[PDB]
């Protein structure tokens, strides 16, 4: 199926406690394959995942100059919003980046992405067009007009359409043994004691990949998508997904309820019971 | 492989 | 604005006393980036914590995972002190291995 190539950049301000923290954290599809941290002496780009072994020196030297450069725009960055919002030069600041690309099962451009924020507050991105930008105040505006007439816009498609997908191929084919796996999840349910005679029917869903997956509870046919407690889809250490979801149903009429899992590794989706 | 970004 | 951290403490595999396993600590949602979250194995730090799976989410609040092996006993417990700026005071969260 489709497959996308993501990188999740981050520069926050300390004042009064050295220069910013800069980290970019690289992804292919659910698993982390990248990641630069400057937080230690000699930070370097270093692999996450098993298969960038396959990479060479060359590789690592270019990745983490290039890093150390994107580290000094980014600390740039932070002294000029502070310009542009008129704040302390005491404050600590985030600023953020997720950028990538998606291809199809063939290989070819599905859609490409830039999206920044400031403080947690979208800033400026680029419009599905990979022609345009939106600025979301004032400040991104400056921004935008520094990037029409510097043609920032060509400059950034070119990778998108360019080294994004050409590069994610790469990976998926050296990591096609991880990346292209299915891991089938193994169901459980617990029971837990409730006050005014009633009790919890937790779901969990254990040892998935890749990530999405469906958990619903329904009562004589009827999914119950509303009284229904849930956790987002975490990962466990080991690249596989765990997650839960519970309802909490009448004392002594539990065996009414059902849990349905539906999941890539699941031909046919599991249904338990307690 | 990561992009090159530009200033703010 | 500021958003707290929620915790989530799990084994990968069901535990089994004896048999091996991996803890992690999910935090998630939180806003500003900067944190400190410890590992404790019977109110004691542990040392080979792996930080891993760094990211945010579509509304930019930050997620991270902490993870270690531990092989399971019946009398050690685990769990897991994070400081973050929406808390004065730091909150742990325990391993509940029947939840
Ligand atoms: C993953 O693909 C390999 C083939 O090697 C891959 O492609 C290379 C060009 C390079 O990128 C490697 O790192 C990749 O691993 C599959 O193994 C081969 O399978 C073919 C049969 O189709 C066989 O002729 C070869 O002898 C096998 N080994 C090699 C080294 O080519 C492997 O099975 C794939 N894994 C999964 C899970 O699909
Ligand atoms: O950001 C600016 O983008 C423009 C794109 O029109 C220029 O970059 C071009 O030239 C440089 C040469 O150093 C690279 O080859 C870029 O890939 C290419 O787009 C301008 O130099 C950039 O500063
Ligand atoms: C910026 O903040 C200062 C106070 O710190 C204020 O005097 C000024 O009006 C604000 N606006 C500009 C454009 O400086």
Redesign the interface.
Known sequence: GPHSLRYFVTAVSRPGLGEPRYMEVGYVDDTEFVRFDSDAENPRYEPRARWMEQEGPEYWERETQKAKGNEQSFRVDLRTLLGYYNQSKGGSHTIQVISGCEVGSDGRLLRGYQQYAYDGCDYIALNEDLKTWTAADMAALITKHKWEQAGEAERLRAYLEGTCVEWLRRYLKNGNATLLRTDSPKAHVTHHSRPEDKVTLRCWALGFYPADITLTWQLNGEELIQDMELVETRPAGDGTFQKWASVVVPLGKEQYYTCHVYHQGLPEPLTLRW | ?8 | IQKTPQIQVYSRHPPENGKPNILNCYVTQFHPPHIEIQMLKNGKKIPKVEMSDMSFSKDWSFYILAHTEFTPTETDTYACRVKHDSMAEPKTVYWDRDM
């Open positions: 492989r990561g992009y090159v970004y530009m200033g703010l």
